[PDB]
Structure 1
């Protein structure tokens, strides 16, 4: 009955755990997306972007996946490519955390390292350059704009939250990288299940481009340490229309918070999980949110961050 034909189908069904040392009388609950193949929420879009591209005919046997990503999406696409028998090339600055170069190499990824001083843009340039060499051979999935990103969250992540809270969820707090998570979850709960919850996007105070944009202020991205969020631009897969509130969190507090999750709750989450919880804790301690059930996405697990600043 419940046997997955390959690892890409085993995505999701991640659990909700109530926090004891955050929030007020258990109003803060976390969704542990570290409980996923490849250990992050991105396993969901890794799978669905491939599935959709197959259904569309844009991805077929023989064709190669090419994309730029220096985060969890590369690991997600790698495991999906391996599971379903696609060749994959990932471009990323030559400033990767070796372990990730090995993890990816171990997954069969053709690593193309670009110059670091170029950063992501360097890498995306090389990706598109490689796609240009034979557009018939290479397909780029484009996580920041590919609608299959938020769609998978609308079909799985959102419905899991609804079901596990028995529709009692009042607030969703999620860090924004591509925006896919908050977008899909919000669409699911507000539009499909019809409940007017509060959707809270989280971003680094160091690079608060969503806050600046919505305020009509000058957009000034900046460097930060909250891996997975703060892209420094507004991605196409962030639907600003469903965002009710934006909370900013600083890198040190995000880090301190992730450490508290481990030491105090026995929850092994990544830096961005600490950021999401710090924002949620702030809301949870406002009297306006006292009798509200707040669900916080924890995007990844902490062992992906041994030798960062977390440990």
Structure 2
């Protein structure tokens, strides 16, 4: 029998750890879930269903229900694109678009771009963890409280917009090298902004955010460590690649993407590899010395890609190579992608060129729009 899951979402407070992901993996591999006699008594199984994008839970005795029955494949988007509010628009206006590029890669690799700037608040993939993280807080943290994090630009914007829609104040901290939209847009949205001209990176700022959290008592939402980041991308981003691959009739052989917190590419890899362990994850390694906004190298410390049972292959990509790929996608597709998006296309093109990849459909996650990076675009033109 089916029950609406939204009545059981307190498992999102109480379940801790990654062991519930074993249930997620098995449900996704088999395409079905067993009925719970007493759903309340199995909170890891319930959380596993939520995280894979179920909206209904299987209830009763000895029965089972398919992904489809459980709502993994429900259509959420109103056909006419009318929404009663911004947050409802965020939530129901999904999937983000999956668009086949006209670029051809060697060796039968066909490229589809998932365009994460189709998110209403930060015009980036960061809307998703910001909504999941603030929503998780909202039953436990008093309205009017301050929330804060370190950000490279996007999450700070997403966080400021969402905190404010939920009745919180926000503070964002940025390194000096962050884009200007990141330093300015959060103030437009009512947040306080602290810029550290000395910080050589975003994670460099975390000790300072933690120390101020202890003194001032704000909630440090820590997108680098908060499992709600990875979980947002499981029930959103990753579920979408899966359902979009099926309904689109793609022959999905892999996904490609970049790594900041590692939240969205861990979810994409974990979720798809649960369905078919041979699906590749091709991930960008910014070349040493280079700065590609929003992303960084794996050995600088990333939670989910490291702790989860995920296969992937790395590819080094210089800033200059990322920007060359921005230029090529622009002139092929009329789509203006961000540097991190250019880096991921480049990473996939490299793996294609080396003969490493099967022919088929590959999905590249494009974190944001290139309109936000005019002076990198200028440098790339020369």
Please state how far the C-alpha of 1:90 moved relative to its aligned partner: 1.0
The structure 2 residue matched to 1:224, chosen from 264, 267, 290, is 290
2:336 to 262, 268, 279: 268
Alignment correspondent of 2:228:
148
Partner of 1:53: 137
How do 1:114-133 and structure 2 match up within 5 A?
A: 114-116=196-198, 119-120=201-202, 123-133=205-215
TM-score scaled by structure 2? 0.69
| Alignment CA distance shift 1:116-1:162 (3 Å) | same
Corresponding residue number in structure 2 for 1:178: 261
Q: 1:90·1:110 contact (CA, 8 Å) conserved in 2? A: yes
SS of residue in 1 equivalent to 2:300: coil
Please, what is the CA RMSD of the aligned residues? 2.4
Indicate the structure whose relative CO is greater, using CA pairs within 8 Å and at least 6 residues apart. Answer: 1
State the shift of 1:85 in Å.
2.2
User: Alpha-carbon deviations, 1:243-276, whole Å to 9, x = none?
Assistant: 3211111111111111111122111100011110
Aligned residue pairs, count: 290
Measured after TM superposition, the shift of residue 153 of structure 1 is: 1.0
Q: Distance in 2 between matches of 1:293 and 1:34?
A: 21
1:110 counterpart residue number: 192
Larger radius of gyration: 2
Q: Is the 8 A contact 1:154 1:186 kept in 2?
A: no
**Paired residues of 2:199 and 2:205 also in contact (CA < 8 A):** no
Pairing 1:1-311 to 2, within 5 Å after superposition? 2=78, 3=83, 5-7=85-87, 10-11=90-91, 12-24=94-106, 27-37=110-120, 38-55=122-139, 57=140, 59-116=141-198, 119-120=201-202, 123-135=205-217, 138-166=218-246, 168-191=251-274, 193-194=275-276, 196-206=278-288, 223-231=289-297, 233-239=300-306, 241-287=309-355, 289-308=357-376, 309=379
- The CA distance in 1 between the partners of 2:109 and 2:313, in whole Å, is 22
CA distance, structure 2, for counterparts of residue 90 and residue 9 of structure 1: 24
Deviation at 1:282, TM superposition (A): 2.2
User: Structure 1 residue 16: deviation in Å?
Assistant: 1.2
**1:41–1:300 contact (8 Å) kept in structure 2:** yes
Secondary structure, in 3 states, of the residue corresponding to 2:360?
coil
Contiguous gaps of at least 5 residues in structure 1? 207-222
SS at match of 1:75: helix
Shift of 1:86: 1.3
TM-score normalized by structure 1? 0.84
Partners of 1:290 and 1:52 lie apart in 2 by 40
Contact 2:100/2:113 (CA < 8 Å) preserved in 1? Answer: yes
Q: Which moved more, 1:193-202 or 1:60-69?
A: 193-202
Is the 2:323–2:380 Cα contact (8 Å) retained in structure 1? yes
Distance 1:142 1:4 in 2: 30
CA 1:134–1:30: 2 relative to 1, 3 Å? same
Distance 1:6 1:86 in 2: 16
